[PDB]
Amino acid sequence: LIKYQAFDASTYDQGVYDFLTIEDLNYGFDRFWLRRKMRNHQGPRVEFFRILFEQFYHPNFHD
């Protein structure tokens, strides 16, 4: 979101939202997923699913 000041730090009743929504700025996995380049380190066929199964287990996919 490099062209904008892509955070919301607003006050009392002055919040304004135009194509950057409230949920994208400050709610949950939308806000978390928009900031994923903070957490890059700095094959694709089989190891992707194996690492996702071992690391981030969830019964709606893996059970």
């Binding site: 006050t11 009392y12 009743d13 949950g28 978390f32």
Partner: protein, 115 residues
Amino acid sequence: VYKGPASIPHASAEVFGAFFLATNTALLAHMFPGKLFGSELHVRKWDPDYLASCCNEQGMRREALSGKKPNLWLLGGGPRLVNDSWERMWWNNLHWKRWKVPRTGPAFPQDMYWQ
């Protein structure tokens, strides 16, 4: 082992320790109202508008019981003697009253949300 000339003041490490712990505790107390042994942290006792309204109430009541026409005292200041606009004439009290919501505060969220 040489610290300095001893005529220049040295601040102790306890001052910084108290400053560090107090800033962190103030932030934590502002984020969680109701959990300070069941209470919260305020930065004042009375609203200035509330105090001035009480003082104006008692002042005009005492003026009225003494047989005079009562006067309202204005926060910020009285009128300017102009002739071009109403807003310029009454600018000082308007300037006090326009700042009401940030004077009341706070500038941080009043309730806790977990990201």
